[PDB]
Amino acid sequence: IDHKADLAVAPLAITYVREKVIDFSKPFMTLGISILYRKPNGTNPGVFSF
Amino acid sequence: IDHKADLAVAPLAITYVREKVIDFSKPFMTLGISILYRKPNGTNPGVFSF
Amino acid sequence: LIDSKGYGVGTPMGSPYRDKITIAILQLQEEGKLHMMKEKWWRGNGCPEEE
Ligand SMILES: *[C@@H]1O[C@H](CO)[C@@H](O)[C@H](O)[C@H]1NC(C)=O
């Protein structure tokens, strides 16, 4: 906002609160919130399987 | 390009040429090429397959 | 995708580069170069053989 840089290329939110104070351009990519998990081993309790 | 008005709030792809000659808002519905195909033919009954 | 957000470039107000960079981004996007270089810098090991 004080122009102490030039066009900033970096992971940077597109937020309303920032767009109000700084200017943005067309996104080069889109984010997302998604789960992260480890694939199951496959093992199951001795009661459920049979 | 003429001035009937400022707005056309419709599905309108923001392509290179269209931004050459049209100022665009930021995207609201990101769109992509996918494929459409049938689920299993699944032609099995519980009546007589036994 | 629980949420939708976009990485865009920052600049102060009145910058002439906003539009010139938007068009550049659109052309490079149509070039698919972004796609392949994203693949490269997000490639890593790959899946081993596990069947
Ligand atoms: C997988 O096995 C590890 C031990 O090798 C165990 O700690 C973990 O709970 C198991 N997880 C699943 C989903 O089977």
XYZ file of C-alpha atoms and ligand atoms in Angstrom:
165
model
C 0.000 0.000 0.000
C 2.991 2.329 0.409
C 4.411 1.071 -2.938
C 7.512 -0.256 -1.164
C 7.388 -3.054 -3.740
C 5.999 -3.669 -7.196
C 3.696 -6.406 -8.504
C 3.874 -9.108 -5.844
C 3.824 -12.719 -6.999
C 3.269 -14.959 -3.978
C 0.592 -17.055 -2.268
C -1.727 -14.194 -1.402
C -5.409 -14.281 -0.551
C -7.833 -12.445 -2.818
C -9.737 -11.210 0.194
C -12.235 -8.386 0.309
C -10.284 -6.930 3.218
C -7.121 -6.897 1.112
C -8.793 -5.932 -2.170
C -10.188 -2.905 -0.338
C -6.631 -1.755 0.387
C -4.587 -3.416 -2.361
C -5.275 -4.199 -5.991
C -5.388 -7.683 -7.479
C -5.615 -9.241 -10.924
C -7.092 -12.344 -12.543
C -6.175 -15.427 -10.485
C -3.570 -17.686 -12.054
C -4.841 -20.587 -9.922
C -7.590 -21.454 -7.437
C -7.273 -22.728 -3.872
C -9.450 -25.075 -1.877
C -9.981 -26.481 1.575
C -9.863 -30.263 1.413
C -9.331 -33.102 3.848
C -5.971 -34.803 4.288
C -5.709 -38.427 5.341
C -3.658 -41.584 5.163
C -5.083 -44.390 3.049
C -6.315 -47.293 5.218
C -4.090 -50.304 5.751
C -7.148 -52.466 5.165
C -7.257 -54.152 8.570
C -10.561 -54.382 10.439
C -11.709 -55.566 13.885
C -12.051 -59.308 14.294
C -15.765 -58.895 14.993
C -16.867 -56.943 11.927
C -15.177 -58.957 9.187
C -16.877 -62.313 9.441
C -18.067 -2.063 -27.021
C -20.977 0.236 -27.778
C -22.926 1.556 -24.801
C -26.282 -0.024 -24.327
C -25.127 -0.300 -20.710
C -22.209 -1.507 -18.585
C -23.452 -4.939 -17.593
C -24.003 -8.436 -18.907
C -24.394 -10.691 -15.852
C -24.380 -14.008 -17.695
C -22.133 -17.044 -18.051
C -19.430 -15.368 -20.129
C -16.004 -16.954 -20.404
C -13.192 -14.554 -19.551
C -10.968 -15.379 -22.506
C -7.841 -13.601 -23.677
C -9.638 -11.887 -26.550
C -12.628 -10.954 -24.403
C -10.382 -9.229 -21.864
C -8.629 -7.483 -24.735
C -11.929 -5.785 -25.624
C -13.981 -6.153 -22.415
C -13.195 -5.226 -18.837
C -14.290 -8.082 -16.590
C -15.161 -8.501 -12.941
C -13.507 -11.280 -10.981
C -14.819 -14.815 -11.565
C -17.651 -16.105 -9.420
C -18.207 -19.614 -10.882
C -15.014 -21.322 -12.034
C -15.685 -23.748 -14.863
C -13.805 -26.676 -16.333
C -13.948 -29.394 -18.954
C -15.075 -32.724 -17.539
C -16.663 -35.849 -18.997
C -20.076 -37.474 -18.741
C -20.612 -41.212 -18.866
C -23.012 -43.917 -17.795
C -22.817 -45.637 -14.418
C -22.828 -49.517 -14.440
C -25.258 -51.003 -17.016
C -26.062 -52.824 -13.727
C -28.631 -55.186 -15.299
C -28.864 -57.702 -12.390
C -32.036 -58.732 -10.458
C -32.438 -60.337 -6.994
C -35.396 -62.323 -8.326
C -33.798 -64.974 -10.507
C -30.007 -64.523 -10.638
C -29.818 -67.156 -7.914
C -13.160 -28.713 -2.215
C -14.715 -27.364 0.968
C -13.780 -23.784 0.095
C -12.831 -21.682 -2.921
C -9.986 -19.161 -2.909
C -7.693 -17.743 -5.547
C -4.049 -16.707 -5.589
C -3.699 -13.364 -7.335
C -0.902 -10.818 -7.627
C -0.867 -7.779 -5.394
C -0.315 -4.180 -6.384
C -1.310 -0.765 -5.006
C -4.083 1.302 -6.523
C -3.890 2.737 -10.026
C -1.213 0.349 -11.232
C -1.074 0.111 -15.042
C 0.143 -3.465 -14.712
C -3.169 -4.819 -13.402
C -4.714 -5.139 -16.847
C -1.507 -5.981 -18.713
C -0.932 -8.809 -16.248
C -4.539 -10.034 -16.435
C -4.240 -10.474 -20.196
C -0.841 -12.130 -19.790
C -2.282 -14.550 -17.234
C -5.179 -15.413 -19.531
C -2.902 -16.102 -22.490
C -0.486 -18.209 -20.454
C -3.471 -20.076 -19.024
C -4.649 -20.851 -22.547
C -1.085 -21.979 -23.217
C -1.426 -24.764 -20.649
C 2.161 -23.974 -19.668
C 0.873 -23.140 -16.197
C -0.621 -26.628 -16.084
C 2.570 -28.482 -17.016
C 4.864 -26.395 -14.819
C 2.404 -26.811 -11.948
C 2.635 -30.543 -12.539
C 6.425 -30.349 -12.499
C 6.772 -28.256 -9.344
C 4.042 -30.348 -7.699
C 5.227 -33.704 -9.085
C 7.378 -35.211 -6.350
C 7.880 -38.958 -6.272
C 4.735 -40.354 -7.862
C 2.847 -43.466 -6.870
C 4.833 -46.687 -6.381
C 3.547 -50.116 -7.468
C 1.149 -51.535 -4.912
C -1.240 -54.152 -6.327
C -2.147 -49.012 10.073
O -1.127 -49.711 10.750
C -0.434 -48.915 11.718
C 0.728 -49.742 12.211
O 1.551 -50.159 11.130
C -1.402 -48.514 12.821
O -0.730 -47.698 13.773
C -2.568 -47.747 12.215
O -3.545 -47.487 13.216
C -3.209 -48.541 11.077
N -4.223 -47.739 10.413
C -5.186 -48.258 9.645
C -6.139 -47.277 9.037
O -5.278 -49.463 9.445
